[PDB]
Amino acid sequence: VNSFSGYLKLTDNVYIKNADIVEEAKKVKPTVVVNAANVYLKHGGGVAGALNKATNNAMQVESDDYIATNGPLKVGGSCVLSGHNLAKHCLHVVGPNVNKGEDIQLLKSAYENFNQHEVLLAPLLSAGIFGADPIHSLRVCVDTVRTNVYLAVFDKNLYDKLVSSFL
């Protein structure tokens, strides 16, 4: 039993809700919140911009130190950093950005990072400003993640379409 509330159950392990991931994180304080990161951990917009704003830019300060030490992530890769006031940990995961021409096949690799964590709050990777089809992203999520994932879809209209079209 966990603290996530109001999710529709899509599969044995995947749940979905129309919710702002920032507000959901502040309420649940999950062990792991997933960020829709880029390789530079520059959290300027999209999900990352919103999460970072909610940390009063502390996420960005920590991220800049991480990059200065380790260099950029790989597309499809991840790193674990602090969750600040939102969660115990933030798993920064880099899905491919279609508006940068990156191979959508790397989306499965990106979701594989979720399997290292027993429970996660997460957005659909490569969705929104990353330009991928969110319906496809949901399919890859369900077919790749085996741990318990609670997906927050900010757009109510997109949420209804994701549910109604789910196979």
Ligand X SMILES: Cc1ccc([C@H](CC(=O)O)NC(=O)c2ncnc3[nH]ccc23)cc1
Q: Looking at 7-15, 18-26, 55-63, 104-112, which segment touches ligand X (CB under 6 A)?
A: 18-26
Among 4, 111, 150, 154, binds ligand X (CB under 6 A): 154
Q: Site residues for ligand X, window 115-134 (CB under 6 A)? A: 123-124, 126-130
Q: Looking at 24-32, 55-63, 72-80, 150-158, which segment touches ligand X (CB under 6 A)?
A: 150-158
Query: Is residue 26 a contact partner of residue 85, using CB atoms and an 8 Å limit?
Result: yes
Alpha helix locations (H) across 36-133?
Answer: 46-54, 58-70, 106-112
What residues form DSSP beta bridges with 48?
none
**Looking at beta carbons only, is 41 or 50 nearer to ligand X?**
50
Among 28, 36, 59, 86, binds ligand X (CB under 6 A): 36
CA 87 to chain centre: 13
Taking CB atoms, the residue at the shortest distance from ligand X is 128
Region for 57 from its dihedrals, namely left if φ exceeds 0, alpha if ψ lies in -120 to 50, beta otherwise: left
